[PDB]
Coordinates of C-alpha atoms in Angstrom, one line a residue:
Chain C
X1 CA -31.0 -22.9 31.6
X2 CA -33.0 -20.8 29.1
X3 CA -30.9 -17.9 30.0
X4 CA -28.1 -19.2 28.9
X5 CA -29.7 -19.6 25.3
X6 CA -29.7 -23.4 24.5
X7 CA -33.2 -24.4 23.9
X8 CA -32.2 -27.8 22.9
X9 CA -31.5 -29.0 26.5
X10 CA -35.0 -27.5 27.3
X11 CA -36.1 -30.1 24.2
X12 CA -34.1 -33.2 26.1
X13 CA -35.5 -32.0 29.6
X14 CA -39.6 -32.2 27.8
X15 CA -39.0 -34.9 25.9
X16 CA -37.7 -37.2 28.9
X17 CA -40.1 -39.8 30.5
X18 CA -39.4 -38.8 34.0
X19 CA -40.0 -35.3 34.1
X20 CA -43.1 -35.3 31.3
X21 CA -45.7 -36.5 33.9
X22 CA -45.1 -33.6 36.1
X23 CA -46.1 -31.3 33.2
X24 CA -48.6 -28.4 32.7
X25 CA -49.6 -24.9 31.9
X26 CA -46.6 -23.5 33.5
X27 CA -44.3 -25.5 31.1
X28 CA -46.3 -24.5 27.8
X29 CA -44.9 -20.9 28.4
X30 CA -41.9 -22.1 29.2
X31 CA -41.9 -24.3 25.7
X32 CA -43.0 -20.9 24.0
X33 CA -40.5 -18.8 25.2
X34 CA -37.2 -21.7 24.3
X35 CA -39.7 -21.9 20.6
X36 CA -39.1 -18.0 20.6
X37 CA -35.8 -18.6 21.1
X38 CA -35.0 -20.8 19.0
X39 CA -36.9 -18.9 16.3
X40 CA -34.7 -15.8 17.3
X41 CA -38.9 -14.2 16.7
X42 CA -39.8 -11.4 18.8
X43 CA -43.9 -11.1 18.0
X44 CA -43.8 -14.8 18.9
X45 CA -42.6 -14.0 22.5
X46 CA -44.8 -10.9 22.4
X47 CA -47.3 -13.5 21.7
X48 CA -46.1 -15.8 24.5
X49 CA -46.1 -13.0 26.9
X50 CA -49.8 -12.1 25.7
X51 CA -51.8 -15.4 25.7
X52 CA -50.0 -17.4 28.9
X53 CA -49.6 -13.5 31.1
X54 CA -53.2 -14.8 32.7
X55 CA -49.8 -18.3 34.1
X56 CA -47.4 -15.3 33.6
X57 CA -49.3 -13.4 35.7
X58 CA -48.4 -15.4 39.1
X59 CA -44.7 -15.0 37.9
X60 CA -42.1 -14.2 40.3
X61 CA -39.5 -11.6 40.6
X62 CA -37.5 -13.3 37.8
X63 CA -40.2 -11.4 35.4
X64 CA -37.6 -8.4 35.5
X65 CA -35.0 -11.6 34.2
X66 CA -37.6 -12.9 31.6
X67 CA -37.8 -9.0 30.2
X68 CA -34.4 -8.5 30.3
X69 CA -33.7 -11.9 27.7
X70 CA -37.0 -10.0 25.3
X71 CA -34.7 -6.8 25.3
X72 CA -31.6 -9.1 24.8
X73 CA -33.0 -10.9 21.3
X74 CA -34.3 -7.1 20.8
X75 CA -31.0 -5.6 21.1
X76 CA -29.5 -8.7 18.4
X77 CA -32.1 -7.7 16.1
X78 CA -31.2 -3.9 16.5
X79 CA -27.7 -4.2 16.3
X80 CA -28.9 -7.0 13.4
X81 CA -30.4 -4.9 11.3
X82 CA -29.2 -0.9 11.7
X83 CA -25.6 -1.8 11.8
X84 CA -25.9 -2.9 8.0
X85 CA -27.8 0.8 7.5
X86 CA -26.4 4.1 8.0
X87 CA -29.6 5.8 6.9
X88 CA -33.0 4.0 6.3
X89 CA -37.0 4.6 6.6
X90 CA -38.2 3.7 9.8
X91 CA -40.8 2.1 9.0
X92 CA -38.9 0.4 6.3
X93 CA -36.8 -1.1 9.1
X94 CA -39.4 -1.8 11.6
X95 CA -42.0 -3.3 8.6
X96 CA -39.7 -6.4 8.9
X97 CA -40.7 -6.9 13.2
X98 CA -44.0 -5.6 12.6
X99 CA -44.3 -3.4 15.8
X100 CA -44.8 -0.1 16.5
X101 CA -41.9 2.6 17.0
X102 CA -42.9 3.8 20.8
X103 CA -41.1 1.6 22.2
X104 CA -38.4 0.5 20.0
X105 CA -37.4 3.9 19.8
X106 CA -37.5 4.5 23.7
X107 CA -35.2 1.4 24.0
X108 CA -32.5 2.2 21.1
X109 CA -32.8 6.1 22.6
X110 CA -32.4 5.1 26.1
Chain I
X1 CA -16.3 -20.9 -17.1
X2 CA -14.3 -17.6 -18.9
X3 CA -17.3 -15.6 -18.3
X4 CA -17.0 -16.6 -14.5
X5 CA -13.1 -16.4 -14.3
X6 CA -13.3 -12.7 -13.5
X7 CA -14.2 -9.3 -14.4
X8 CA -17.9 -10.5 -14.9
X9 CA -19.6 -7.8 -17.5
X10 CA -23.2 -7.1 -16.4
X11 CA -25.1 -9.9 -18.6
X12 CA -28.5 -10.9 -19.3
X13 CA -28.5 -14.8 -18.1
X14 CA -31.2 -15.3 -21.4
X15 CA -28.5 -16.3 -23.3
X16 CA -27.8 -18.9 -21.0
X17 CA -31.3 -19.8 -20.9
X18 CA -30.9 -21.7 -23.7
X19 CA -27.5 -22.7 -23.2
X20 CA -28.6 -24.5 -19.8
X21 CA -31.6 -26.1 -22.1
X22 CA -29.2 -27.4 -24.7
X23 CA -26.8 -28.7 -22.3
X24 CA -29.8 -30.5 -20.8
X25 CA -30.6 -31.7 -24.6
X26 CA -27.7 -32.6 -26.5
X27 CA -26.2 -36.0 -25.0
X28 CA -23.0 -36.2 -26.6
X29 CA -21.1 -34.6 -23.3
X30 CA -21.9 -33.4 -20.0
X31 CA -25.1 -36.3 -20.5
X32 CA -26.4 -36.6 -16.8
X33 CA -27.7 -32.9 -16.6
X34 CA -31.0 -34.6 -15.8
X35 CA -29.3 -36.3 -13.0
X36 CA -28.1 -32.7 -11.8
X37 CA -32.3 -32.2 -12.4
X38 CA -32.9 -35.7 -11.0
X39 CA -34.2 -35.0 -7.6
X40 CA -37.7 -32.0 -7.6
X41 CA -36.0 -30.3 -5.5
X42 CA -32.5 -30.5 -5.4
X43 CA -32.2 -29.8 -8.8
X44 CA -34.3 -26.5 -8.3
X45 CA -32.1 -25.4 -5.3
X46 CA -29.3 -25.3 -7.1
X47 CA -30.6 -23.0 -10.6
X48 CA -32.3 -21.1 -7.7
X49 CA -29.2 -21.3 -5.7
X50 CA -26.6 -20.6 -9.1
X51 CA -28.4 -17.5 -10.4
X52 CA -28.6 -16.1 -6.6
X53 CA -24.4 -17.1 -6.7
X54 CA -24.0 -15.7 -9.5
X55 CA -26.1 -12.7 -9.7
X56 CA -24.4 -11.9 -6.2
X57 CA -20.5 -12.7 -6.9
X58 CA -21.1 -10.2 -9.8
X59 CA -22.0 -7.8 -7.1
X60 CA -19.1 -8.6 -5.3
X61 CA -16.8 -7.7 -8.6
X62 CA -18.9 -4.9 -9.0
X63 CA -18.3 -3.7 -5.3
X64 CA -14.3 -3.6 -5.7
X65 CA -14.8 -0.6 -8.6
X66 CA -16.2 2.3 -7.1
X67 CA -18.1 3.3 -10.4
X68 CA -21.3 4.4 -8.0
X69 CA -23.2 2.0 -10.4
X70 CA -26.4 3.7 -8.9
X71 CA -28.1 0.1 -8.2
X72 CA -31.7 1.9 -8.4
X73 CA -30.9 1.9 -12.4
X74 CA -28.9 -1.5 -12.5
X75 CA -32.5 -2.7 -11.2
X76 CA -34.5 -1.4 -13.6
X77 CA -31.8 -3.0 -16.0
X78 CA -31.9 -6.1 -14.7
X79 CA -35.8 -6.8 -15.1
X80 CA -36.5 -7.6 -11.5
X81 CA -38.2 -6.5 -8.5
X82 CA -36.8 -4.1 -5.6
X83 CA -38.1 -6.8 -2.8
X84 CA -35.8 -9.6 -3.9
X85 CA -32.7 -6.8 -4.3
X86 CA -33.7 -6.5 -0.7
X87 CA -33.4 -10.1 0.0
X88 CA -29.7 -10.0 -1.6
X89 CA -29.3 -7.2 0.8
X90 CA -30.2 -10.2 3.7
X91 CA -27.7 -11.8 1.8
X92 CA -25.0 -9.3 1.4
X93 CA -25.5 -8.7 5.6
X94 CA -24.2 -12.4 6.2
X95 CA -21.9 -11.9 3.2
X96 CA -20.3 -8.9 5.5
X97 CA -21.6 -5.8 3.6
X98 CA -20.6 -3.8 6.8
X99 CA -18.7 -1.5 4.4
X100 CA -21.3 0.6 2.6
X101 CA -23.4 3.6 2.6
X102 CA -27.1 3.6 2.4
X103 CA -30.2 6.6 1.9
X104 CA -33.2 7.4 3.5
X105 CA -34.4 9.5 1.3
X106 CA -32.8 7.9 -2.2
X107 CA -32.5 4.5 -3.2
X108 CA -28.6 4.9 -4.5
X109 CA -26.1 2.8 -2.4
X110 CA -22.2 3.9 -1.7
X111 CA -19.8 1.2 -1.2
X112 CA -17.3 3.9 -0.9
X113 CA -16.9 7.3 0.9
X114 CA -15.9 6.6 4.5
X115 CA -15.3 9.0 7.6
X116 CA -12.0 9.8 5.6
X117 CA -10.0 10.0 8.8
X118 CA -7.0 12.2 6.9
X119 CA -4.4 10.8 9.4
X120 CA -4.6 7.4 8.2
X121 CA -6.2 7.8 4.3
X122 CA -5.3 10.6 2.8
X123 CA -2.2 10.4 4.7
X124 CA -1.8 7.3 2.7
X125 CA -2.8 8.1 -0.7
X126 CA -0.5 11.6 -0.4
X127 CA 2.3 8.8 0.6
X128 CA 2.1 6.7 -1.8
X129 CA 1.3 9.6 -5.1
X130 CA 3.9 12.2 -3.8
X131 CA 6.3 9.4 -3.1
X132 CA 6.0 7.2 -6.1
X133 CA 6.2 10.8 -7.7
X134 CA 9.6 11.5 -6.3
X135 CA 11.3 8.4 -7.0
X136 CA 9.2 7.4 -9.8
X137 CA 10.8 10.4 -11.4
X138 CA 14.1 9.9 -10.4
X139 CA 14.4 6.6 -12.0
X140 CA 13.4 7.7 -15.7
X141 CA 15.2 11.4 -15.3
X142 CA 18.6 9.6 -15.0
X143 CA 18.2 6.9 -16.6
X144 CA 17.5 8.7 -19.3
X145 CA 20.0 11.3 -18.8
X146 CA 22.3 8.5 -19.6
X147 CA 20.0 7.2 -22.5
X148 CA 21.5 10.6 -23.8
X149 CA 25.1 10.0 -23.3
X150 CA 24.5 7.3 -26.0
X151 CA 24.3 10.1 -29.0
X152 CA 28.1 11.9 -28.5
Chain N
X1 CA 17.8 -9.7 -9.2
X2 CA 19.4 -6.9 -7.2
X3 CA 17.6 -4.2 -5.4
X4 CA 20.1 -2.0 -3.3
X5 CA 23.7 -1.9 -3.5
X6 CA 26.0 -0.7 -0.4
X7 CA 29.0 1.5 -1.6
X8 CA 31.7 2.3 1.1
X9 CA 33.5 5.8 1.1
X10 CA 36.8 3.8 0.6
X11 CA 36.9 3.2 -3.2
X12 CA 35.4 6.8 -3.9
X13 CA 38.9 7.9 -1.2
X14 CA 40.4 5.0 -4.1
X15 CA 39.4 7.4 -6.6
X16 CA 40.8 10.5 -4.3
X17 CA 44.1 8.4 -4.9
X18 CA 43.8 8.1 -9.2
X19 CA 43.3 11.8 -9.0
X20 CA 47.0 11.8 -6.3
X21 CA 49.1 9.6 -8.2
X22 CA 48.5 11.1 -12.1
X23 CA 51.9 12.5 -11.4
X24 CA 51.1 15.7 -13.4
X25 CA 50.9 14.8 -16.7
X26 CA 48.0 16.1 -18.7
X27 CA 45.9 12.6 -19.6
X28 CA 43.4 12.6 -16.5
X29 CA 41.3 10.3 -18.8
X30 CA 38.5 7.7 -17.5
X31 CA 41.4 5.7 -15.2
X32 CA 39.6 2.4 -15.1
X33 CA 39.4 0.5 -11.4
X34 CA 38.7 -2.9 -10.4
X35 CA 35.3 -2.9 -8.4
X36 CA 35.6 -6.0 -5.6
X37 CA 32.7 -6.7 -3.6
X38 CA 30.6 -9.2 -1.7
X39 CA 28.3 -11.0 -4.7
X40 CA 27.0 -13.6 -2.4
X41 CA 24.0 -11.7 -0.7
X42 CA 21.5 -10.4 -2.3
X43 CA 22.7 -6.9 -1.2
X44 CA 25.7 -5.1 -2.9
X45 CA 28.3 -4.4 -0.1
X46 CA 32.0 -2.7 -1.5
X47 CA 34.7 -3.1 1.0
X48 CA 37.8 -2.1 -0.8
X49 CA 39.1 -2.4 -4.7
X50 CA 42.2 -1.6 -6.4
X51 CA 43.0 0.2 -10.3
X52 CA 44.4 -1.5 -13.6
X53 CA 46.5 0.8 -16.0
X54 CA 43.8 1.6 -18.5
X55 CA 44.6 3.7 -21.5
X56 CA 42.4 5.0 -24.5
X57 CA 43.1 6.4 -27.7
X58 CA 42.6 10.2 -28.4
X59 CA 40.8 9.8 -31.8
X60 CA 39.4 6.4 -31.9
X61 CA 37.0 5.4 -29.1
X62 CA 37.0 1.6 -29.6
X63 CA 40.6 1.2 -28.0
X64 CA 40.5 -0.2 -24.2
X65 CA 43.5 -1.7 -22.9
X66 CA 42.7 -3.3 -19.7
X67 CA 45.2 -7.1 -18.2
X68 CA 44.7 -10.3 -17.0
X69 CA 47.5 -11.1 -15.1
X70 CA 47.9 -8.1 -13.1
X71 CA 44.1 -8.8 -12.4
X72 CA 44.7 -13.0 -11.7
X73 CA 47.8 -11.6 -9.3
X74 CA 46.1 -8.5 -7.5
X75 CA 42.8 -10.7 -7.4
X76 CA 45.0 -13.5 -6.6
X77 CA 47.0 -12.0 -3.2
X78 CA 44.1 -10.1 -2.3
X79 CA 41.9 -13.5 -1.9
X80 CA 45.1 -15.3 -0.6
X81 CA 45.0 -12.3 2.5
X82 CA 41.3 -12.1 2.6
X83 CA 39.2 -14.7 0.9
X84 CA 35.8 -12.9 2.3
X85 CA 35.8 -10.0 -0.7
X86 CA 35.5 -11.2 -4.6
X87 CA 35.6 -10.0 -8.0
X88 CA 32.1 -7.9 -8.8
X89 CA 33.0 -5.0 -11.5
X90 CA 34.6 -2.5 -11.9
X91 CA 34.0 1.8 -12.6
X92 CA 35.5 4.7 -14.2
X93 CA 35.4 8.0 -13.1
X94 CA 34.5 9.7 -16.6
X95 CA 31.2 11.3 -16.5
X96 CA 30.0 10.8 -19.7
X97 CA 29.1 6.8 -20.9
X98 CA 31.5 6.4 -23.6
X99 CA 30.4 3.6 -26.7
X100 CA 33.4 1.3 -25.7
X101 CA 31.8 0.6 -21.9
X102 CA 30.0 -2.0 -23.4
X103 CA 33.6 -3.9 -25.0
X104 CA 35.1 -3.0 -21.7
X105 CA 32.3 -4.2 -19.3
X106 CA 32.0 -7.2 -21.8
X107 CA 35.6 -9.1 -20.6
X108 CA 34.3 -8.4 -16.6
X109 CA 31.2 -10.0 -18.3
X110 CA 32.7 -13.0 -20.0
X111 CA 35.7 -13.8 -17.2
X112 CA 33.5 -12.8 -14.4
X113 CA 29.9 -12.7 -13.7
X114 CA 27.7 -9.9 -13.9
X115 CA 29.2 -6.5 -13.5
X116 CA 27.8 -3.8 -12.2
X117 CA 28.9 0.1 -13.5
X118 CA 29.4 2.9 -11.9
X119 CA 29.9 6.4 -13.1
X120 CA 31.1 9.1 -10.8
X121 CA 32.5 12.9 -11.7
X122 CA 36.4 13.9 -11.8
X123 CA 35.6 16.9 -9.5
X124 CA 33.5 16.9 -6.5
X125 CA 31.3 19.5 -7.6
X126 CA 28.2 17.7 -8.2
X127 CA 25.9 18.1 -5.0
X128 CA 23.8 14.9 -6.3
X129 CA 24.6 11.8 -5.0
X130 CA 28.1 10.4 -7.1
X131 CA 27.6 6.7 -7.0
X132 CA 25.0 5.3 -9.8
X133 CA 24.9 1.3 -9.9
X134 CA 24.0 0.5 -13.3
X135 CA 23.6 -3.0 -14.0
X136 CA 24.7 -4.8 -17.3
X137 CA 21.7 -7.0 -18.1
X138 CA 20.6 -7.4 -21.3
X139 CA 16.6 -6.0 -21.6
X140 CA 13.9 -6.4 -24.4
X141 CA 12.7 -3.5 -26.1
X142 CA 9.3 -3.3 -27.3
X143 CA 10.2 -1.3 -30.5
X144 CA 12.0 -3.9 -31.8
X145 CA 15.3 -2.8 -31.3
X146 CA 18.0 -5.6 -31.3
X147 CA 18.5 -6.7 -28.6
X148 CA 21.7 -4.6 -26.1
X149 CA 23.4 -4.4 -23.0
X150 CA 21.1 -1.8 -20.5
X151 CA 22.8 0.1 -18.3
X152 CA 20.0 0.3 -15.5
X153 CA 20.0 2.5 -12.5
X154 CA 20.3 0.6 -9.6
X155 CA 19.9 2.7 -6.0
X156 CA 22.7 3.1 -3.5
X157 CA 23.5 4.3 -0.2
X158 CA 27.0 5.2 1.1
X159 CA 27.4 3.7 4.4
X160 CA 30.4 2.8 6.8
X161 CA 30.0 -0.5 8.7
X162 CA 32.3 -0.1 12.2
X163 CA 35.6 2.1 11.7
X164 CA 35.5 4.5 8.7
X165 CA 32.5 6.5 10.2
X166 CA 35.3 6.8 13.0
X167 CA 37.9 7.7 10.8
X168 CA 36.1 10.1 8.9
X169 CA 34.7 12.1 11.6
X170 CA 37.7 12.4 13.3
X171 CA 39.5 13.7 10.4
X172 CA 36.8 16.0 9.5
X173 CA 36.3 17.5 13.0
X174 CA 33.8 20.0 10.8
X175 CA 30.6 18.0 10.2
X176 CA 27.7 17.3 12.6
X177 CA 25.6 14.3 13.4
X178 CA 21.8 14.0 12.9
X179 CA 21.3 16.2 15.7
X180 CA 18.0 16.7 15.6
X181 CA 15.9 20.1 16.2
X182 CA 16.8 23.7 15.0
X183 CA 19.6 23.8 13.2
X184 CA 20.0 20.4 11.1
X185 CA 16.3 21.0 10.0
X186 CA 16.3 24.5 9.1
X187 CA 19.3 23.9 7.2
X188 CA 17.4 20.7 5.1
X189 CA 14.6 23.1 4.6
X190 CA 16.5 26.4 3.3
X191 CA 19.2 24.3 1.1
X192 CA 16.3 21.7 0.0
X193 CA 15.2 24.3 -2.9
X194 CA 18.3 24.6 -4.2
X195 CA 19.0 20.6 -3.9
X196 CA 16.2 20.3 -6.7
X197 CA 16.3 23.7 -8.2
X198 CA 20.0 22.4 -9.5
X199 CA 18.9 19.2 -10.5
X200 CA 15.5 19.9 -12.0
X201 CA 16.9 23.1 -14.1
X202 CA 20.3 21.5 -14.9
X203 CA 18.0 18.3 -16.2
X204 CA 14.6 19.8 -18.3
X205 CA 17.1 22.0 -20.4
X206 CA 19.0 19.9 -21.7
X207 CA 15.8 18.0 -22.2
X208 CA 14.0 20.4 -23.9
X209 CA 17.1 20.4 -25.8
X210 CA 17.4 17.3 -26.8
X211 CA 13.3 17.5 -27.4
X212 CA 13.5 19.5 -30.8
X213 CA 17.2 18.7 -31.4
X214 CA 17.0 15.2 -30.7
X215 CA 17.5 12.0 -32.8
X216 CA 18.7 8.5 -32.5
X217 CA 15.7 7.4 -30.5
X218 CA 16.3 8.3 -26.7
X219 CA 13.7 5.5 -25.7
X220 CA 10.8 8.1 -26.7
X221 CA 8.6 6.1 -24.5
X222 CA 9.3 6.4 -21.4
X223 CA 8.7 10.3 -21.8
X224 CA 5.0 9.2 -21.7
X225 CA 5.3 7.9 -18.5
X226 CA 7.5 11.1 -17.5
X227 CA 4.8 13.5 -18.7
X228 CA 1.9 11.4 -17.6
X229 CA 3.1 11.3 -14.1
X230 CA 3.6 14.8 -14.1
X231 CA 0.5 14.9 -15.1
X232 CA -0.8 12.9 -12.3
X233 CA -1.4 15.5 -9.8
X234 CA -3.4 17.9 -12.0
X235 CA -3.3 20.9 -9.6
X236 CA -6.0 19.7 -6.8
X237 CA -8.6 22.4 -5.8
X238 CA -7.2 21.6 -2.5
X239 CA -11.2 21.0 -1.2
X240 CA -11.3 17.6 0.4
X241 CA -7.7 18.3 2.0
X242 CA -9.4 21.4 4.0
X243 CA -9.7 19.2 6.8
X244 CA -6.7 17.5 6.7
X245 CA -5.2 21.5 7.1
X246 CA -7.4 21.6 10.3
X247 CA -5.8 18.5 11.7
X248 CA -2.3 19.5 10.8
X249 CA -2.8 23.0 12.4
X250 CA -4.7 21.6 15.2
X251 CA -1.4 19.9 15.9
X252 CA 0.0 23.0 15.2
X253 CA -1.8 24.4 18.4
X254 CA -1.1 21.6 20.1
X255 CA 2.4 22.8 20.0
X256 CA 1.5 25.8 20.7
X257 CA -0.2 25.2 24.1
X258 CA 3.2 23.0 24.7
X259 CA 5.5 25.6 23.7
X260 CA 3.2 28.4 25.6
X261 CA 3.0 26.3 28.5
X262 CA 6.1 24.4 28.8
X263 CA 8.0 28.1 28.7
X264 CA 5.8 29.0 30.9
X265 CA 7.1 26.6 33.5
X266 CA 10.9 27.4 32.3
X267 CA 9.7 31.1 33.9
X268 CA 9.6 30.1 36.9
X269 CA 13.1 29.4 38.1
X270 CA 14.3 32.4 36.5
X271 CA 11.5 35.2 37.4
X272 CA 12.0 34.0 41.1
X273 CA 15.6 33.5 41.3
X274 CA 16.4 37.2 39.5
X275 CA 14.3 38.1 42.8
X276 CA 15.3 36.0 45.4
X277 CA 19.2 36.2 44.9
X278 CA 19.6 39.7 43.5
X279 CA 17.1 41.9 46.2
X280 CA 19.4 39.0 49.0
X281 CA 22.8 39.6 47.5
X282 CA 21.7 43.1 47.8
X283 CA 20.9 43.6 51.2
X284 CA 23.3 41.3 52.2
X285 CA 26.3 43.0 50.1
X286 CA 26.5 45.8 52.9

């Protein structure tokens, strides 16, 4: 249901009675990634994918599905911010997401 | 309201400074301007909100004329910072600046100069000059051939 | 009010017939005809007309003799065998506007409503266009002039609805349709020169003329708008339209590669059948 970006269901589905008692560390990550949705932040789900990757870690093959919704919300910020600018700094561009240019240029390149 | 009907000159709003202050003072009309300045913050969202309309509707009269009014200098005339001009930039990207021209190396913006496809551009200006031209002047070369006949 | 008119060929083969019944007689003056037309459209549309006797005076311009009840009667049996086709104007055939078009074009102004004027040439050797609808409507002049009836040039086309493009091809048996290719457009593009060299050069001198030796204000102020868009292409260095001559003469090899090709394929019949059926014919002759 996150993958279909509607965080607010995933808001209704923590805040009901009947499923909150069978909560835990796997549903913290899962409450980062719909806040980093919501957000439409990247550095936040960076951060998500950084502090919960030791319940991350045990994740299953849908990791490859969790990466490919990062490189989604990447590709709205790309196609967010360069399609308003023909030519622009780099680093004038990539100030505003605060990361480094490896490997936002190997994903616009590729 | 004339100054906002249309072809808005490039004004300093400190004339209206004190405008906005005596129409907060004087209570003989427009009284409840501190009812418009009632709430802390409502009141503050919309000045904020008013100079920001207006000082980006004048960009959007501005952006009809292709004058190339080199907005690295409008800045400097204007008595503000570079980041906010930025910010209106966030703005003009929701108000659908997809038309325009930026620089990497400059700071000058170009609202104009497209690819120029000459199929569909040039092909149109040439139309519309050569034609209106042609039967531009054959309306006035007649008609005034028989403005002539007038004289015998 | 009115933005095209539609002129038949049949009142201009009208005016073939005032120049067949003069009767020899040495007058051939600016015979006056009753315009009829279809006012209710926004469009100008002239299906037939008819003449009035109309005479002048030699010396004294101001003298129009034009009738009512020959116009009530014509007007009248003509509506009482078609009551589709009503009164519009009317034209003469002189080619110079006379002073005394405005008395005449006044009664068709007063009796009926607003006329429109046309001005054609006695002989047909004029290779412009010789229909000119000029409206009567009264204008305002910024000079301060009083205020006049304006003869305005309204555009028209000469067009045939259902049967006269019939009639006149078959009795010309001489000119061709739009046929398009070689010939028609060749033929556009050698005479083309001439078409404006006449009018340009038979126009600027008496312009130039009347430019030095002129008085009795010509409307002086539209030449400003004359000159200033002549001046409105200022000789352009031709730079930004460089490219535009690579995509017209990339076309222009694009019709080279069809023409190379295309013929190309056209060889092939004839390079194999002059083989085929002359070295046969041959060998099988004896």
């Amino acid at each position: 249901k996150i993958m279909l970006n509607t965080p607010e269901d995933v808001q209704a589905l923590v805040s009901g009675k009947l499923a909150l008692r069978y909560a835990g560390r796997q549903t913290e990550a899962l409450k980062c990634v719909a806040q980093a949705s919501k957000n439409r932040s990247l550095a936040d789900f960076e951060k998500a994918l950084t502090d919960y990757r030791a319940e991350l870690r045990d994740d299953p093959i849908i990791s490859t599905h969790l990466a490919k919704l990062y490189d989604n919300l990447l590709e709205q910020n790309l196609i967010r911010v360069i399609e308003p600018f023909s030519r622009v700094q780099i680093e004038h561009i990539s100030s505003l997401i605060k990361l480094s240019k490896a490997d936002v240029e190997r994903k616009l390149s590729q | 309201l004339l100054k906002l009907f249309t072809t808005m000159e490039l004004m300093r709003w400190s004339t209206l400074v004190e405008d906005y202050g005596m129409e907060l003072r004087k209570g003989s009309l427009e009284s409840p301007a501190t009812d418009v300045f009632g709430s802390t913050e409502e009141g503050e969202k919309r000045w904020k909100d008013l100079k920001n309309r207006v000082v980006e509707h004048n960009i959007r009269i501005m952006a009809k004329y292709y004058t190339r009014i080199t907005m690295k200098r409008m800045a400097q005339l204007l008595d503000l910072s570079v980041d906010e001009s930025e910010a209106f930039l966030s703005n003009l990207v929701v108000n659908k600046t997809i038309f325009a021209k930026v620089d990497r190396l400059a700071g000058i913006i170009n609202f104009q100069r497209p690819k120029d496809p000459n199929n569909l551009l040039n092909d149109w200006s040439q139309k519309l000059n050569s034609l209106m031209s042609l039967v531009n002047k054959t309306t006035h070369l007649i008609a005034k051939e028989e403005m002539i006949h007038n004289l015998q | 009010a009115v933005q095209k008119v539609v002129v038949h060929p049949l009142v201009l083969l009208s005016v073939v017939d005032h120049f067949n019944r003069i009767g020899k007689v040495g007058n051939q003056k600016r015979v006056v005809g009753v315009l009829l037309g279809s006012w209710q459209k926004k469009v100008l549309d002239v299906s037939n007309s008819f003449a009035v006797p109309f005479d002048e005076d030699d010396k004294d311009d101001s003298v129009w003799f034009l009738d009512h009840d020959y116009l009530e009667n014509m007007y009248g049996m003509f509506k009482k065998v078609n009551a589709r086709e009503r009164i519009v104007g009317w034209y003469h055939t002189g080619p110079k506007l006379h002073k005394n078009d405005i008395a005449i074009n006044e009664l068709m102004k007063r009796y009926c409503p607003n006329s429109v004027l046309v001005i054609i040439d006695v002989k047909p050797k004029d290779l412009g266009l010789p229909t000119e609808a000029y409206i009567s409507v009264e204008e305002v002049h910024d000079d301060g002039t009083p205020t006049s009836k304006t003869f305005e040039h309204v555009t028209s086309e000469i067009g045939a609805e259902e049967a006269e493009e019939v009639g006149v091809e078959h009795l010309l048996r001489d000119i061709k349709d739009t046929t398009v290719g070689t010939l028609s457009q060749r033929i556009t593009n050698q005479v083309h020169g001439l078409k404006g060299l006449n009018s340009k050069l038979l126009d600027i001198r008496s312009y130039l003329e009347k430019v030095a030796t002129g008085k009795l204000p010509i409307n002086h102020q539209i030449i400003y708008q004359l000159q200033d868009v002549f001046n409105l292409l200022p000789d352009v260095s031709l730079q930004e339209f460089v490219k535009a001559f690579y995509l017209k003469t990339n076309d222009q090899m694009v019709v080279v590669y069809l023409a190379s090709l295309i013929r190309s394929v056209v060889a092939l019949h004839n390079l194999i059948n002059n083989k085929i059926a002359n070295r046969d014919a041959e060998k099988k002759e004896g």
